[PDB]
Amino acid sequence: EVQLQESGPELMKPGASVKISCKASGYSFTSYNMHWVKQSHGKSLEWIGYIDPFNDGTTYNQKFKGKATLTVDKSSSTAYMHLSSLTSEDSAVYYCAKLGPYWYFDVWGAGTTVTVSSAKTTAPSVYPLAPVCGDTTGSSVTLGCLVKGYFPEPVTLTWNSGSLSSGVHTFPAVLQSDLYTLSSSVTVTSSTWPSQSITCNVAHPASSTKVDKKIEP
């Protein structure tokens, strides 16, 4: 059976173009053709079109005529999808998929995320999260670390330089005026804090800004 490896995530400004690839490795005893599919918002699947690596036939969804171009390099076993004039509506995960003689999509690439944003690289501002000190009474306490106005994803957030691992919850980012904000919260015993040092270590590699921040009442 063949395996399909798509190319890495891509970050583009409106008006740019992009070329995603999908490399087939392994073997197949029967011929097959390559379909490309778009997932929007994580649920809305859309057929873009297909190319046949064997007879060179292509068919497009009418919505994607002239936006998308499918090609193949038969010597490297690689399919390519080129998107012209990227818009916010092109922000999505793109999958390639094998359809062979039974006309079910039996192998899929893991997908390539394309993000279309005119936003600039901005580092995060990292804020402490501590309880209202009146509500100190309780056997466990939960702290946190707010990461606001970063771009682009990703950011990586740890606790006490990775030493503190359990009790931790890092939430998904929200999109707030073309920048992302995050948060991660920890639960430790009421005796551990404020007695011990609880410090979050936020990293934003895409601006080479790593930041530490310890928390007090």
Binding site: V2, A24, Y27, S28, F29, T30, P53, F54, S77
Partner: protein, 228 residues
């Protein structure tokens, strides 16, 4: 790494069986991506694929229609080879028989029927005549331009059956300006060819010239010194 070594008699009597073998080096006969084909070449038919065998959780065989009814292609996992058997041959089966690998060349991981490695070919003659080994005579250089210029000398290989015969000079040492002519078929029904070379006249006194003649069908080997 992949090599194909063909063997087995080139001369086959009418109505009898052609038997050829192709021994594989640098891959397995049962490899998941190896397809073992026989293909033949004649003037009548040009290049004609005859059939294959391949392993895929059990041996498969496909044959061309022209021969479906008298052809068998069999693998031997023991010796790592596969064989061709054609039954009840007629002169129409006189041809050069090649073995060939397919399925190494793939597009998007699938076998695309490109034949990437071929054996050397066995020349097959269907005839009831007997094998006869050549006589080898010298074509000696003349006294013309011995003092300075170019000498022509050669060997004549006459009255051999069947084809082919190979000729080399000085066991390969001399190849530049060698012409080995296509055999002709004499009215006797035996073949004859010449092999000739042009050499500096000044070498005639210092360098030896020997034509090495091989006729595999009769196990005839001859090395003939050609001299003034």
């Amino acid at each position: 790494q992949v090599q194909l070594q063909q063997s087995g008699p080139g001369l086959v009597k009418p109505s009898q069986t052609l038997s050829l073998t192709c021994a594989i080096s640098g891959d397995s006969v049962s490899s998941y991506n190896a397809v073992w084909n026989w293909i033949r070449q004649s003037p009548s038919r040009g290049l004609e694929w005859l059939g294959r065998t391949y392993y895929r959780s059990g041996w498969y065989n496909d044959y061309a229609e022209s021969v479906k009814s008298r052809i068998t292609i069999n693998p031997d996992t023991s010796k790592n080879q596969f064989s061709l058997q054609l039954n009840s041959v007629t002169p129409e089966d006189t041809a050069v028989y090649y073995c060939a690998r397919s399925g190494h060349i793939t597009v998007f991981g699938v076998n695309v029927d490109a034949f990437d490695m071929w054996g050397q070919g066995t020349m097959v003659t269907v005839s009831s005549a007997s094998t006869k080994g050549p006589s080898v005579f010298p074509l000696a250089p003349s006294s013309k331009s011995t003092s300075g210029g170019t000498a022509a000398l050669g060997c004549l290989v006459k009255d051999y059956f069947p084809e082919p015969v190979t000729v080399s000079w000085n066991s390969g040492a001399l190849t530049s300006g060698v012409h080995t002519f296509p055999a002709v078929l004499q009215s006797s029904g035996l073949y004859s060819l010449s092999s000739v070379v042009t050499v500096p006249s000044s070498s005639l006194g210092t360098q030896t010239y020997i034509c090495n003649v091989n006729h595999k069908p009769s196990n005839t080997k001859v090395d003939k010194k050609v001299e003034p």
